[PDB]
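Notes, p. 3: input format for complexes.
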Amino acid sequence: NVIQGQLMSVSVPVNTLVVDTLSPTSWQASTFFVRNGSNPEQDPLRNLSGQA
Amino acid sequence: MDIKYDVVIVGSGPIGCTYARELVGAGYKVAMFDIGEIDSGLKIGAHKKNTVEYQKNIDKFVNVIQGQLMSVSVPVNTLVVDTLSPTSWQASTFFVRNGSNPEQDPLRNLSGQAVTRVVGGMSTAWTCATPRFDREQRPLLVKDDADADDAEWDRLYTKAESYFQTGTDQFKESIRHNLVLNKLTEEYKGQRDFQQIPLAATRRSPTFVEWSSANTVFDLQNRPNTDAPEERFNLFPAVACERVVRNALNSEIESLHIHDLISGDRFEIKADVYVLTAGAVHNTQLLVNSGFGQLGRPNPANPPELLPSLGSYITEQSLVFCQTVMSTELIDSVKSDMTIRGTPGELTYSVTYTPGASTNKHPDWWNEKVKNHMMQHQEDPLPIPFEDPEPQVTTLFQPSHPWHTQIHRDAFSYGAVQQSIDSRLIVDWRFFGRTEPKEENKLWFSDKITDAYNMPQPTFDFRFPAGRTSKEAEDMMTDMCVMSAKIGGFLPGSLPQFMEPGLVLHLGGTHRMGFDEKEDNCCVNTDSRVFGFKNLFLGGCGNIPTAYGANPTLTAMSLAIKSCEYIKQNFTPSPFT
Amino acid sequence: MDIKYDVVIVGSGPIGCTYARELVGAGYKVAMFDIGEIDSGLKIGAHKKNTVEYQKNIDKFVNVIQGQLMSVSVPVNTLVVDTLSPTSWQASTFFVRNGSNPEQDPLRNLSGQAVTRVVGGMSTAWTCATPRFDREQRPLLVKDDADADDAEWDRLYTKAESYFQTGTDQFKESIRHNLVLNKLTEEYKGQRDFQQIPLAATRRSPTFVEWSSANTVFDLQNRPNTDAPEERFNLFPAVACERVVRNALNSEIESLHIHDLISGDRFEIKADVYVLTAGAVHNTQLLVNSGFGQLGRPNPANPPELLPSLGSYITEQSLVFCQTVMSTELIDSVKSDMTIRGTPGELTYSVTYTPGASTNKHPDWWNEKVKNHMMQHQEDPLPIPFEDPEPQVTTLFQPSHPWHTQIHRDAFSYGAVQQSIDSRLIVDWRFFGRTEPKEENKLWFSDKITDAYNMPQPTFDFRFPAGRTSKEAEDMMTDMCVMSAKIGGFLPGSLPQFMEPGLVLHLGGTHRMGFDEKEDNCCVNTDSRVFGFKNLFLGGCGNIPTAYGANPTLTAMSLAIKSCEYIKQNFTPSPFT
Amino acid sequence: VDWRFFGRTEPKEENKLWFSDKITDAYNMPQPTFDFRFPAGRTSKEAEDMMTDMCVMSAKIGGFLPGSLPQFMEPGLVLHLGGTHRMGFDEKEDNCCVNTDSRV
Ligand SMILES: Cc1cc2nc3c(=O)[nH]c(=O)nc-3n(C[C@H](O)[C@H](O)[C@H](O)COP(=O)(O)OP(=O)(O)OC[C@H]3O[C@@H](n4cnc5c(N)ncnc54)[C@H](O)[C@@H]3O)c2cc1C
Ligand SMILES: Cc1cc2nc3c(=O)[nH]c(=O)nc-3n(C[C@H](O)[C@H](O)[C@H](O)COP(=O)(O)OP(=O)(O)OC[C@H]3O[C@@H](n4cnc5c(N)ncnc54)[C@H](O)[C@@H]3O)c2cc1C
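Output follows (1310 residues plus flavin-adenine dinucleotide):
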């Protein structure tokens, strides 16, 4: 927990995971937009995802 | 295998079997084709749950369901696997892999939508719930005459219920059923009515229910046969029906193009009457492959010549789900009439009740079951008998609670931790919302991508409409949370949730019915006849044009029965020589 | 429903069907009972994988397997659920719930052991791998004459291979098959031999394999019939066989007690010859229920009168598994003979090769498939055709590598992250260990607890023996890790692992064969006749007394053939009337 | 017992850490971006050989613990990143940033 608490990921690609069980009332995206500190420059397939 | 029949029916689900029952019975020479194969035992197209092994182990039945359901449209997968060995081959892109549909926007899908290809269709695995629609959910069959419309629906529903062997009595002596039914009846006294879910089923013994299916409607045996020597029927499994051939005037179908998947032979089959009952998705595909509507990505700057409403106004229900673990209060209430002397397991443990007494909260049949269970199974901490059938409760859709409800048990794959909980305690909650038909909600077919049978790939463009549909959906979730709390708290791992869109498999509206093609934005009339065409009929839930919450099959069947009336009035059977 | 037959067979799996084929063919009046039902389509007891739907979507077949397998012994569940609502009924103990077996020590189980109750038995779902056993795995049929023993096994295996339609050529032109086969051949040149897994299967087209089953062995149609007017066979599904009735001398069976699960009636069936082919677990259960061996927890202070070795010396194979993702080097090797010019998706793109060139690493049939795939699908990054069949590779058990291997694909439920990986890249690895027979490893039956058919509840007392069995199992894991690395790295989510004990379903030795009851600690002789009884025979994997790694069914069938030879020489068919 | 085997990675010009001229990180600095794959050839072959070596060596001590089966870890979780401002004798000839006194 100490290790995890301090390590901050260097580059997180844009997330493309589909959540399709939201309630119909909830605000939902039409695109996988740049969200939550993600790096749109980052090719998810050419990353060091574990770098922190 | 002739290639000339009076009537050809595509699909051997319950709706195809309705046409078969009516038209075989009326003396037509009928052929039925199904792309799937016979796999329910000696009873062709029968319910797969009607084996002794599945009646002993219901939850294993989820595997049957899963095994037959094939996802309609799976978007290209973009999940990152970045812990492959460096030696393993990897693509540099998320390429079209594994049958995925690159046309599909993953965020406007009915990802849970699936199809079954087997003789008997989805009715070899369905849950058998067959409620009628009230007016609010129901398409009109009679204009400007509400009482005539009512009367017509009643006649058709009553017949449909007879074909399906629908009843509301098969669970009447279940302790769990009555516990839940009685409690909710009391809680909503003067506010909502509860009853048994109407089920297409016949109980055969205290531990066996014969669930209905396509077989119940029509046994699917070739005719003539000893029991039906004057009837004429052939079923041809493993035959892919690919297209209907239109005449140049677009007034009649001239033939049905088929591909025998076993022999590989192709034929053109001629009939007087062509009936498409391949399901809401595949009827649509067949029609598009035949030059109805439009192939490819919808382009409103080029509307198609035939059936411009085909594949628009699609509806699928919102589904919320949870399970509950029965309250202590309710479990204790089961044994309320019991006098318990001694400690269980020891010498003079006794459990007694007075038959027929007036302070008894429960009927004798109930207390006798409870007594014998508590006495013969002193190691067991619950008062519910081990073989007590499950609850099957509903409060049907009403304007003040515009969703269908099922408070019951069906096949479920419990996690190991959930299997920690005694099954007698668990109740499933499924509430089903109605979805407004909107033109923008579409099922379309790729002009480049093809499916597993080399047909144009189905693609959804779907979102639950804003406004009433979405507000009701959320109100329905809250209702489930409120109502279920009267019975018990949520089972961990089965917390209240919306199901993946389309997992419900109540898709409607893909080839929708109405009085007038243009005014009502529709594809078939009230005889289920394709506008403009003398001799082409569509059957199934794709016909239903309304926003409905209740399970649609009985309604589709009723429409089919009306369609068959038109056929019997307009086409003459060939003489049986 | 005569009450008198020449031969009665309990079970309609492939072993029961071996007896049927032999004895029906030899003119015996045969009845066969199965507790399960007919549900493989028109071909009774056929392989469920032989539908066009499953040939197109093989991974969905996992559901068929799971849906029919019922766990043999499930220990009491001690998982803590502590997030229930305070209103929900909560246990104070881990009581006997949900069909769990309180006799079962959770730490000495075969938790993966399961049984199938359907017409055709497990052969409706099996993987069809039918290797022969080499001497080291194989029980003796001839003592003190290895050559005679070899010849007898050869004769028997050859017939069994004919009954199953075993072959080694159904995947001969698969690219993936040969890619793997060739690499492993080269990597182990002079050390190990590789070949196609011998499979009970007939290829019908490039995309259809008709997998063998019980139906292949005997079609299970009642006889006499048009094709077999002089034969006499009746199959009676949904009939629980409960007991064989011993005479007081314990020298003869006098009848078979059955329970019709549909009518609910019990009957006694008389036959000259009684054959128990109910599976390794249920043959044992039937015998124990009939007074053979010992009911209840074994007590060495109180050995049973009849068949003291029954249910002891049980064997089940260790199984290790992983999947791999094909190496870049191997994938690139697929197209080694190609000249690639231009760039994909353009006019200029050219993929060509020279048929017959001596420098080619691959045959023309391979290069043609590669060239067409690459030219016709320029958007696809892989050189393997979409419809290329799977690998089916083995190196068979040898003293220096005392495990069976399967390097192949079979139905698998890939997680969504794993579905990210193109299926063409994936190979399954399954290595099967041999287990020493030890008297302490037991299948026994409760005197108190009953199963779903009201029969004594099976209970395992099992651990993999120390010594050779354990050393070899770990050595086998390592060999899998080493060998698989030559093909590609592990697929995340399918990392090298031991499978749950018994999931393999290769249980043997529960009613084991030997020359002498006492000396060889056994229950049947080499004719599969129960010691002391004139007219009682056991068939199946329970007969096999050795430590074996290879798939056992072919060996069990071979023994059944030999058993039938004895039956044919010692009992006379009734005259056909 | 935990088993961790660490491979060596060939330095290749194409494997880069670069910084966005538009996106910024939590401290308003140019956002780091990786363009990295394990080099083909020696690096990759050795990585796989290393996996096999772990499988072989670990079995001498005991079998794998379920849930901690042999696996590659997520790239960079190791945090042994090197060569981003690398040392050499000659800036041009050795493709480097600091000399052997670590002087730029
Ligand atoms: C698990 C489950 C639970 C359900 N529960 C309920 C419930 O409780 N109540 C309810 O009302 N509904 C329920 N349903 C839905 C119900 O099963 C369907 O509404 C109903 O079966 C539709 O009937 P159908 O005859 O129109 O189509 P289907 O049953 O889908 O049959 C159509 C058939 O046409 C075939 N076919 C498709 N394409 C072609 C082609 N090109 N050529 C030839 N044949 C083709 C198929 O192989 C198939 O057998 C459930 C379904 C599932 C699977
Ligand atoms: C997924 C799967 C993969 C497999 N792969 C392979 C393979 O690759 N190679 C191989 O060699 N083996 C494999 N097997 C094992 C193989 O299927 C069995 O060894 C074989 O089917 C055993 O044949 P049997 O006739 O003795 O028994 P079973 O096939 O088990 O048939 C026994 C039958 O008797 C019945 N029965 C049970 N109790 C009673 C009773 N009291 N009364 C009446 N009937 C009764 C059953 O309902 C059943 O049909 C696999 C099995 C499965 C499930």
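The pocket of flavin-adenine dinucleotide (ligand 1) is lined by residues B 10-16, 33-36, 65, 116-118, 121-123, 125-130, 240-241, 277-279, 282, 286, 505, 540-541, 551-553, 556 (CB under 6 Å).
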